[PDB]
RNA sequence: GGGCUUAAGUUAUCCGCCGAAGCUGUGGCAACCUGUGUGGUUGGGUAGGGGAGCGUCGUGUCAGUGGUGAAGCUGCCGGGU
RNA sequence: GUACCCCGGGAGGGGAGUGAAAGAGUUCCUGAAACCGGUCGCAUGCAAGCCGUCAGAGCCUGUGUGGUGAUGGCGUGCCUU
């Protein structure tokens, strides 16, 4: 029962070389280099899937800060005022408002202002 | 399989467009040295190409010229086109069989010598197809 | 008129006739579910108080079940030999918002 | 009427062979031997 | 369950009657035990004539290909080392026998259960003979149509007492013919019907019984 | 690092916020224990131990299947942890 | 086992014929990868790059999915030891 390796062996090679189908140089042509690069790509993508939450939250916070500073309020005071007012709209929707519906955002800024400690 | 139009060189080089082609296979010259002349000859009018290759100093100018002439002759026989209204639409060089040889070096060593070959393909079409 | 609504730990900006992707619910296609509103904008009129948002009902109709992208996880650390292969799909519920009634 | 294709062993009767040194998803590389030393290559006599 | 039962000796239409003694033809069908016995049977059929050459049996390879140090090449001790093209095989097959030392009680019980499985399925027939006179294959082919001619096993007696029946059924290719002293689990589990000859059943019952 | 004393420096105090794969929310998977209709706890990992599987070849049997096109190779569209 | 004709000194090719099939033409079954090229789409000559990953405009295509991808963040190979 002598078995030849090729039929079983080429499957993972085809898979890896398909996953490396935009890489530059040896990384898209040779199975060993493509395998190393796919190891790195998997590590990178797992890490960036977790870092995406923080990245998008940072972008939302920056946009909310910019839109609330045009109304004379800092981001920290705006967030504290929305917390005190009870309006639980998250930073994703707050940034969506700050871009698309700036009048609704300014009304929310007024709501946050009226709900500050003022002390 | 049981499908029509088995693949052919004409269908891949011309594909129902008027024109013709020629291939010189196993030319005992390296593919790079043939390409140095083929890059000059590609896209040119065929008669201008053969007259220029008559004067090109390179050794690969004599093979390629012949190929072009053969292509022109083919177009003058299967299509009725004249030589003066043909242009070299496509031109490329592929590698042929490379013979292995040994050159004896110093201190009992032998270095490897590769005798390379080339296949030269030239496809000619009427000049009216240059912009179409 | 549109609303900021919540549906399973996530918030969406919906309008009447909007096809929205929601964290999976246990409801059959063609059934009508309700989304809890966090804000309502009717044009220069923004509803934000709890007592007024309790009156507002956002009603949507369950379209079917969709799938997220296929995710390949390959956990790897060099000079150990350690690898771990995994996959994920993350099915969702597609939903069509049919009403925002104050 | 049992026929030959409905003969199967008792569950647990035929334990699968553990094939060593066939990748690191199993007992790969050192094949359960560790690194270096006597035990990496032969064995130790019991009288020793 | 050990009820001895009565089956109709046929010879085409009708004859006397024959006993299935119960101690065999009515016992538990033990699927794991029958599987073990059949696997042992199929292992004993293995010729096992598979051999390879180790690095010491390959031609040549006596001398070191080159020096241990200084050449810039990897260290090699022979040209027939297993990583060389044309070298020895490391753990390739060598001739062996696959016969297993199955206990006798297990083999007998497995044959008993295999017979009982189809004694309870009413696929066992007893005939006086299959042919009169010389050796036709046509006549006993007609006679074995107590069921469909498919995976049948004909149990006859001796190599001489049923010479005519044996030579008649020899070429049917859907009939496996056995002597009663050579009854085995594989051929019974393989069969869809058993047709005993009267004397074949007599020999089998006399050989092994209570 | 830019720049900073007009502190963006040290210090005391007060009020906010940012910030991790931590915790919470929501949607899947898995191991063990437990009353056996709640569920609870748990699931980073080298050497290493245990458990369960994918793919290749040969092979008994059964059911087949193949020039109206098998194997192998090569695309596209899908599927599973 | 390619008669005959065309270009060529030939090699080679183009027509044609034989054959079910010639891209089965004697380097002859199948014909993978490395490697070598022709063509088309996008990007690329102010830029510091383990060459990927996440975010993302634009263009092409739209076989409404796919190709490329300016630009921003994060990011020091594989194995052995
Ligand atoms: Mg977080
Ligand atoms: Mg010398
Ligand atoms: Mg380490
Ligand atoms: Mg390891
Ligand atoms: Mg290793
Ligand atoms: Mg070692
Ligand atoms: Mg040590
Ligand atoms: Mg040790
Ligand atoms: Mg000893
Ligand atoms: Mg010990
Ligand atoms: Mg020797
Ligand atoms: Mg020696
Ligand atoms: Mg040999
Ligand atoms: Mg956690
Ligand atoms: Mg673990
Ligand atoms: Mg381990
Ligand atoms: Mg058929
Ligand atoms: Mg096969
Ligand atoms: Mg002929
Ligand atoms: Mg072909
Ligand atoms: Mg071939
Ligand atoms: Mg530039
Ligand atoms: Mg730098």
PDB file of N, CA and C in Angstrom, chain D residues 1-11 14, chain E residues 31-32 34-35 38 117-118 121 186 189-190 192:
ATOM      1  N   UNK D   1     -29.867 -12.696   7.763  1.00  0.00           N
ATOM      2  CA  UNK D   1     -30.085 -11.539   6.906  1.00  0.00           C
ATOM      3  C   UNK D   1     -29.172 -10.377   7.288  1.00  0.00           C
ATOM      4  N   UNK D   2     -28.149 -10.664   8.097  1.00  0.00           N
ATOM      5  CA  UNK D   2     -27.289  -9.598   8.604  1.00  0.00           C
ATOM      6  C   UNK D   2     -26.445  -8.994   7.489  1.00  0.00           C
ATOM      7  N   UNK D   3     -25.979  -9.814   6.542  1.00  0.00           N
ATOM      8  CA  UNK D   3     -25.115  -9.366   5.448  1.00  0.00           C
ATOM      9  C   UNK D   3     -23.773  -8.851   5.964  1.00  0.00           C
ATOM     10  N   UNK D   4     -22.760  -8.819   5.096  1.00  0.00           N
ATOM     11  CA  UNK D   4     -21.411  -8.527   5.568  1.00  0.00           C
ATOM     12  C   UNK D   4     -21.183  -7.048   5.858  1.00  0.00           C
ATOM     13  N   UNK D   5     -21.957  -6.144   5.258  1.00  0.00           N
ATOM     14  CA  UNK D   5     -21.711  -4.723   5.475  1.00  0.00           C
ATOM     15  C   UNK D   5     -22.360  -4.175   6.739  1.00  0.00           C
ATOM     16  N   UNK D   6     -23.173  -4.958   7.440  1.00  0.00           N
ATOM     17  CA  UNK D   6     -23.709  -4.543   8.727  1.00  0.00           C
ATOM     18  C   UNK D   6     -22.996  -5.197   9.902  1.00  0.00           C
ATOM     19  N   UNK D   7     -21.808  -5.751   9.680  1.00  0.00           N
ATOM     20  CA  UNK D   7     -20.940  -6.190  10.766  1.00  0.00           C
ATOM     21  C   UNK D   7     -20.017  -5.042  11.159  1.00  0.00           C
ATOM     22  N   UNK D   8     -20.172  -4.549  12.381  1.00  0.00           N
ATOM     23  CA  UNK D   8     -19.311  -3.503  12.904  1.00  0.00           C
ATOM     24  C   UNK D   8     -18.851  -3.877  14.304  1.00  0.00           C
ATOM     25  N   UNK D   9     -17.679  -3.406  14.720  1.00  0.00           N
ATOM     26  CA  UNK D   9     -17.158  -3.787  16.035  1.00  0.00           C
ATOM     27  C   UNK D   9     -17.914  -3.088  17.154  1.00  0.00           C
ATOM     28  N   UNK D  10     -17.676  -3.566  18.369  1.00  0.00           N
ATOM     29  CA  UNK D  10     -18.227  -2.909  19.537  1.00  0.00           C
ATOM     30  C   UNK D  10     -17.598  -1.527  19.700  1.00  0.00           C
ATOM     31  N   UNK D  11     -18.351  -0.555  20.209  1.00  0.00           N
ATOM     32  CA  UNK D  11     -17.759   0.761  20.481  1.00  0.00           C
ATOM     33  C   UNK D  11     -16.636   0.655  21.504  1.00  0.00           C
ATOM     34  N   UNK D  14     -11.948  -1.120  18.801  1.00  0.00           N
ATOM     35  CA  UNK D  14     -10.854  -0.806  17.887  1.00  0.00           C
ATOM     36  C   UNK D  14     -10.410   0.632  18.144  1.00  0.00           C
TER      37      UNK D  14
ATOM     38  N   UNK E  31     -23.226  -9.551  16.955  1.00  0.00           N
ATOM     39  CA  UNK E  31     -22.629  -8.793  15.855  1.00  0.00           C
ATOM     40  C   UNK E  31     -21.154  -8.493  16.113  1.00  0.00           C
ATOM     41  N   UNK E  32     -20.746  -8.012  17.297  1.00  0.00           N
ATOM     42  CA  UNK E  32     -19.300  -7.845  17.533  1.00  0.00           C
ATOM     43  C   UNK E  32     -18.500  -9.132  17.401  1.00  0.00           C
ATOM     44  N   UNK E  34     -19.315 -11.914  15.653  1.00  0.00           N
ATOM     45  CA  UNK E  34     -19.293 -12.311  14.250  1.00  0.00           C
ATOM     46  C   UNK E  34     -18.343 -11.420  13.464  1.00  0.00           C
ATOM     47  N   UNK E  35     -18.301 -10.128  13.795  1.00  0.00           N
ATOM     48  CA  UNK E  35     -17.361  -9.228  13.136  1.00  0.00           C
ATOM     49  C   UNK E  35     -15.922  -9.639  13.409  1.00  0.00           C
ATOM     50  N   UNK E  38     -15.213 -12.902  11.391  1.00  0.00           N
ATOM     51  CA  UNK E  38     -15.119 -12.654   9.956  1.00  0.00           C
ATOM     52  C   UNK E  38     -13.839 -11.896   9.621  1.00  0.00           C
ATOM     53  N   UNK E 117     -29.373 -16.368  12.453  1.00  0.00           N
ATOM     54  CA  UNK E 117     -29.919 -15.122  11.926  1.00  0.00           C
ATOM     55  C   UNK E 117     -30.814 -15.368  10.721  1.00  0.00           C
ATOM     56  N   UNK E 118     -30.461 -16.338   9.886  1.00  0.00           N
ATOM     57  CA  UNK E 118     -31.238 -16.642   8.696  1.00  0.00           C
ATOM     58  C   UNK E 118     -32.032 -17.935   8.812  1.00  0.00           C
ATOM     59  N   UNK E 121     -34.979 -15.999   9.718  1.00  0.00           N
ATOM     60  CA  UNK E 121     -35.460 -15.303   8.535  1.00  0.00           C
ATOM     61  C   UNK E 121     -36.024 -16.257   7.492  1.00  0.00           C
ATOM     62  N   UNK E 186     -18.022 -16.408   7.441  1.00  0.00           N
ATOM     63  CA  UNK E 186     -17.995 -15.463   6.329  1.00  0.00           C
ATOM     64  C   UNK E 186     -18.962 -15.874   5.229  1.00  0.00           C
ATOM     65  N   UNK E 189     -22.728 -15.401   6.587  1.00  0.00           N
ATOM     66  CA  UNK E 189     -23.126 -13.996   6.620  1.00  0.00           C
ATOM     67  C   UNK E 189     -23.175 -13.419   5.212  1.00  0.00           C
ATOM     68  N   UNK E 190     -22.355 -13.941   4.301  1.00  0.00           N
ATOM     69  CA  UNK E 190     -22.407 -13.490   2.918  1.00  0.00           C
ATOM     70  C   UNK E 190     -23.640 -14.013   2.187  1.00  0.00           C
ATOM     71  N   UNK E 192     -27.460 -15.112   1.142  1.00  0.00           N
ATOM     72  CA  UNK E 192     -28.830 -14.653   1.330  1.00  0.00           C
ATOM     73  C   UNK E 192     -29.789 -15.807   1.582  1.00  0.00           C
TER      74      UNK E 192
END
